[PDB]
Structure 1
Amino acid sequence: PMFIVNTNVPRASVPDGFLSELTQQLAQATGKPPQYIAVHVVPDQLMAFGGSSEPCALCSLHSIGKIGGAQNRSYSKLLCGLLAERLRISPDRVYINYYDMNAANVGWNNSTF
């Protein structure tokens, strides 16, 4: 999995260790080795959710497999829970877009999977 979070919360509100936590938690959640997990957090964004500037986030999770109805519910609980606990973003102000990528459509290490 690769996980990207874009948020209006300020950089100083991102706690030390957040990218490590996301790595660890995504490894546990997907069963994938941490080596392949990428995480990207983008604070201080100009965004709104429902016409309001209260803390919010727009996220994506891309994986080659491990995407589906129940799995995505579980990921959303995990990830909305982290954004709430760690970044003080209400879960009802987060969207997470999930992508099940074909291996042939993911480049890595000079080739594709």
Structure 2
Amino acid sequence: PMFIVNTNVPRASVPDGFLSELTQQLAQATGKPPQYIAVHVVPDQLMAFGGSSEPCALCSLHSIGKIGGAQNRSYSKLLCGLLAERLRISPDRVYINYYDMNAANVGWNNSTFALEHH
């Protein structure tokens, strides 16, 4: 899985260990091994949410499976919680786009995760 956070919060406000915490929490949430979790945080961004430049975040979570109605609600509570606690961003100023990726559409290690057919 891949989690990306873009925010206008300053770099200095991103706590040390934040990427590690995201990695561990996402492994737990998705049930995927931590070795396959990638995290990316992009601070100091020029953005607005509802016309306002108060702290906000635009995020995406890509996963092969483990994406869906109830699961995404669970992910949203988890991730908004982390953004609010760690970056002090209000949950109502966060968007998270979820993407259920097909294995054949994810490249890794010179190939893709579609190793079964030709």
Q: Same fold (TM over 0.5)?
A: yes
1:91 Cα deviation from its structure 2 partner: 0.2
2 CA distance for matches of 1:3 and 1:40? 6
In our comparison, the structure showing a higher alpha carbon Rg is 2
Shift of 1:49: 0.1
Question: Which string of whole-angstrom CA distances, capped at 9 and with x for unpartnered residues, describes residues 51-72 of structure 1?
Answer: 0000000000000000000000
| 1:40 counterpart SS class | strand
Divergent runs of 4+, >2 A: none
Cα RMSD after superposing both structures: 0.3
**CA deviations over 1:35-88 (Å, ceiling 9, x no partner):** 000000000000000000000000000000000000000000000000000000
Find the residue that maps to 1:52 and give its secondary structure: coil
**Percent identical:** 100
Separation (CA, whole Å) in 1 of partners of 2:78 and 2:15:
17
Query: Shift in Å at residue 18 of structure 1?
Result: 0.2
- Normalising by structure 2, report the TM-score: 0.95
CA-to-partner distance for each residue in 1:72-109, whole Å, 9 max, x for gaps? 00000000000000000000000000000000000000
* TM-score for the superposition, normalised by structure 1: 1.00
Report how far residue 110 of structure 1 moved.
0.2
Residue-by-residue CA offset, 1:7-50 (whole Å, 9 max, x unaligned) = 00000000010000000000000010000000000000000000
Partner Cα distance (1:53, 1:67) in 2: 30
Partner of 1:25: 25
Give 1:14's aligned residue.
14
| Aligned-partner Cα distance in 2 for 1:72–1:42 | 22
Counterpart of 1:61? 61
